């Protein structure tokens, strides 16, 4: 994963959205594409619609997703099984 | 005076100097016994001397580069063979009949396009 010297990676626009939404209280889900961004500690409670190629999958951020890429909770493939 | 020959094998080149003496053989500033681990290599080095029966009355100072253990051993053998050729010409017939003058012109065949090695083709299938 990312080198620890570089610290964590958050995309600037998503950071701006998050800081303003958290300082201005519960708002609309953060419609965002930055799947590569890291879920920071002050992300809790925010509902974020992470892009997945065609949809913005809603993700309710909780404590235990801190340190994970938002794109991990929005799967990008559909699969139900062959010849069910 | 020192009599000199050059032997070659695979990719090994061996300079061999012979001068009458107590039968000391030096390979790259190192004795034969602890330079060659293979008894086959030692036999290969000593083959011309034993076949001409001059084993103890000559001293060998030899420096060889390139190749591996067996290639270097063959290079040594060729070096002694040529050194005794330019020592005396009388033992030439014996060494040829034995087969030591001939420089063994067999190198690793080049890898070729469309083959895994020199001749090992990729596995073929009709379908």
């Amino acid at each position: 994963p990312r080198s620890l010297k570089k610290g964590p990676f958050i995309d600037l626009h998503l950071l701006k959205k998050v800081e303003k939404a958290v300082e201005s209280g519960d708002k609309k889900p953060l419609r965002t594409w930055s799947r590569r961004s890291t879920i920071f500690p002050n992300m809790i409670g925010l509902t974020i619609a992470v892009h997945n190629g065609r949809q913005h999958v809603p993700v309710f951020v909780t404590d235990e997703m801190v340190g994970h890429k938002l794109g991990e909770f929005a799967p990008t493939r559909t699969y139900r099984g062959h010849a069910a | 005076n020192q009599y000199y020959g050059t032997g070659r094998r695979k990719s090994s080149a061996a300079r061999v100097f012979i001068k009458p003496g107590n039968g000391k053989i030096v390979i790259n500033q190192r004795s034969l016994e602890q330079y060659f681990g293979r008894e086959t290599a030692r036999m290969v080095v000593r083959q011309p001397l034993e076949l001409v029966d001059m084993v103890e009355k000559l001293d060998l100072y030899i420096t060889v580069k390139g190749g591996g253990i067996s290639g270097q051993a063959g290079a040594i053998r060729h070096g002694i063979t040529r050194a005794l050729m330019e020592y005396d010409e009388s033992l030439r017939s014996e060494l040829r009949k034995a087969g030591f003058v001939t420089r063994d012109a067999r190198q690793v065949e080049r890898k070729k396009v469309g083959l895994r090695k020199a001749r090992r083709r990729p596995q073929f299938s009709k379908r």
């Binding site: 010297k5 570089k6 610290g7 990676f9 995309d11 600037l12 950071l15 | 080049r110």
Partner: protein
């Protein structure tokens, strides 16, 4: 290749040359180890704000006579097909068929 594809590559090269110095500086802050945490953080953010096309890794070598992105040869700047044609016509110095 397509004219649009060649145009994209030209734009990327131009942007990389234009913004090369700033990227060098910011990456120097990031990979410096005696730089403060605030410095490294702000450098990450500024390197984000720099356009992506500025990244020299974004470029793709293309055959300068056809724009083909595959089979490139850096020594000649051409794909395998163009290298073959020019070499046979003699338009490449010293080059000739090898056999060994």
């Amino acid at each position: 290749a397509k004219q649009s594809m060649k145009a994209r590559e030209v734009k990327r090269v131009a942007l990389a040359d234009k913004y090369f110095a700033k990227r060098a500086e910011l990456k120097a802050i990031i990979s410096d180890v005696n730089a403060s945490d605030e410095d490294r953080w702000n450098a990450v953010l500024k390197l984000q704000t720099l356009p992506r096309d500025s990244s020299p890794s974004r470029q793709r070598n293309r055959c300068r006579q056809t724009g083909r992105p595959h089979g490139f040869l850096r020594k000649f700047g051409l794909s395998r097909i163009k290298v073959r044609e020019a070499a046979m016509r003699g338009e490449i110095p010293g080059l000739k068929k090898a056999s060994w």
